Amino acid sequence: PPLINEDVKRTVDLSSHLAKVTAEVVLAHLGGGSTSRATSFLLALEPELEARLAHLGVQVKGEDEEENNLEVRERFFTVKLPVALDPGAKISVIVETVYTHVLHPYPTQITQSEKQ
């Protein structure tokens, strides 16, 4: 159950009027003990953008989408893997999120013949 992510590549798209960030994260399980449980893995969000989330989705290898349950820890999202991983195996997961109302216009008062 204690595991780390080996390589994470995240791309943020700002060319829309809403920000879409996609993170390819490879979960690896440190081979300590024979506890092969490793079923659900936590997902977290920064506090400043908590209220600005729209739709969170997880896709693996391009295959069927997994299911994520909102979770509270004494917000978080728990993700149930299809096949639990034994210690010493890597799974490639893709986390894609969309944030709405996150690009504020800075000049905030723009004439007709200007740029934004």
């Binding site: 800075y106 000049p107 905030t108 008062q109």
Partner: protein, 51 residues
């Protein structure tokens, strides 16, 4: 005007700072000088001692 004027006007500026203002001294001909930046008014009070 000459950046040495602050020395010979010290009393006024010491009083002004003692009241609680943040004083920035520049020379009237300075390339980095501006009031608005993207419509912000980054300086709330202006003082011209440069005839």
């Amino acid at each position: 005007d000459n950046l040495n004027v602050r020395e010979t006007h010290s009393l006024f500026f010491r009083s002004l700072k003692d009241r609680g203002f943040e004083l920035t001294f520049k020379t009237a001909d300075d390339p980095s000088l501006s009031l608005i930046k993207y419509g912000e008014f980054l300086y709330d009070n202006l003082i011209i001692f440069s005839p």
